[PDB]
């Protein structure tokens, strides 16, 4: 169970960081008109 807990904590942290840093990577600029 503790192995399952660890695994889920890891997978979740992974996806949540993708999300945080993805939006930190200049998201306003990724549109079709005015990029900044």
């Amino acid at each position: 169970m503790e192995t399952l807990k660890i695994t889920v904590y890891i997978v979740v942290t992974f996806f949540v960081l993708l999300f945080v840093f993805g939006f930190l990577s200049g998201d306003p600029a990724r549109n079709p008109k005015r990029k900044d």
Binding site: M1, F15, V16, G22, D27
Partner: protein, 334 residues
């Protein structure tokens, strides 16, 4: 050309058949976890002691249910609002008996569904659209939060959140009526108005546009072949539809502006469903429907019944029968 930047480009690419996006990055795993657990539980989960009284309710197909009676059963009243992930159970067998799977599914779904709404904003931004389609979906989303999260929080138990099944749904709405007189609550009445009105204006708008299609076809072909995807000309005559509908009522009760008309179509069912989600969300704190029981008495003081008193007799029969073994004291305070 860098690794992270190429990944970011694929995540946000407008060229994927299905858009991913950063909301997609959370949505996809959580909706896969909730979907997969739901399907397996619906087919083969063993009975769950929803009410904490060691009386398990059989919800799955292999335990003698059909599509209409089956459900993922809410987790145990003994758990209340405690978090019950798998790794907090001594074993899967325990987690199953106590209704673990409901928690897993509703938390993953509500997350993924919140990200669904955000994904709607996102792709709207990548395509140069206006952004508020997601605001329309917030109405259904708020409704799902009310019956899966808010009402449990206020009543203190996920055992009182809505079951994931067809008859479980009906069970939830019958018990709600006995405990909150939801029919006599104005916010539910606005939900009905939002939903009846929504279906009405759906039919109206569809019949008016359909009534004013411009002849582009022959009687041996579907009229639908008169419109070509991406054509610049509008495909019906709006002045003809205005001319018919304004004479069916009077001129000034009819829309000649297609923008106002379509904004009306959007706002009526959305606002009505906001209110009904707000209904469930505030009855969660026991601010219940109007109570006119014995409100009419005669000159001597005999009670003169009204239709509200008749509703009460039906609510009483719901009250006294539901969860028939779970109450030991005279008032059902949650």
């Amino acid at each position: 050309a860098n690794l992270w930047e190429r990944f970011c480009n694929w995540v946000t690419s407008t060229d994927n058949r299905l858009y991913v996006g950063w909301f997609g990055v959370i949505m996809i795993p959580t909706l896969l976890a909730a979907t997969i657990c739901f399907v397996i539980a619906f087919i083969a989960a063993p009975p769950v002691d929803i009410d904490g009284i060691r009386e398990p309710v059989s919800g799955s197909l292999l335990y003698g249910n059909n599509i209409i009676t089956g459900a993922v059963v809410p987790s145990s009243n003994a758990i209340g609002l405690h978090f019950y992930p798998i790794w907090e159970a001594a074993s899967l067998d325990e987690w199953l008996y106590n209704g673990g799977p409901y928690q897993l599914i509703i938390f993953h779904f509500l997350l993924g569904a919140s990200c669904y709404m955000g994904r709607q904003w996102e792709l709207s931004y990548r395509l140069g659209m206006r952004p508020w389609i997601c605001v329309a979906y917030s109405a259904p989303l708020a409704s799902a939060f009310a019956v899966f999260l808010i009402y449990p929080i206020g009543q203190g138990s996920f055992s009182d959140g809505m079951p994931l099944g067809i008859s479980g749904t009906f069970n939830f709405m019958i018990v709600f009526q006995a405990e909150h007189n939801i029919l006599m609550h104005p916010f539910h009445q606005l939900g009905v108005a939002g939903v009846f009105g929504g279906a009405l204006f759906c039919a109206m708008h569809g019949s008016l546009v359909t009534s004013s299609l411009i002849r582009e076809t022959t009687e041996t072909e579907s009229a639908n072949y008169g419109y070509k995807f991406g054509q610049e000309e509008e495909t019906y005559n709006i002045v003809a539809a205005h001319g018919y509908f304004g004479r069916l009522i009077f001129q000034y009760a009819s829309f000649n502006n297609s923008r106002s008309l379509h904004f009306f179509l959007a706002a009526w069912p959305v606002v009505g469903v906001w209110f009904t989600a707000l209904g469930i969300s505030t009855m969660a704190f026991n601010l219940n429907g109007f109570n006119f029981n014995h409100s009419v008495i005669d000159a001597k003081g005999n009670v003169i019944n009204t239709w509200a008193d008749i509703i009460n007799r039906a609510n009483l029969g719901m009250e006294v029968m539901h969860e028939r073994n779970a109450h030991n004291f005279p008032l059902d305070l949650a």
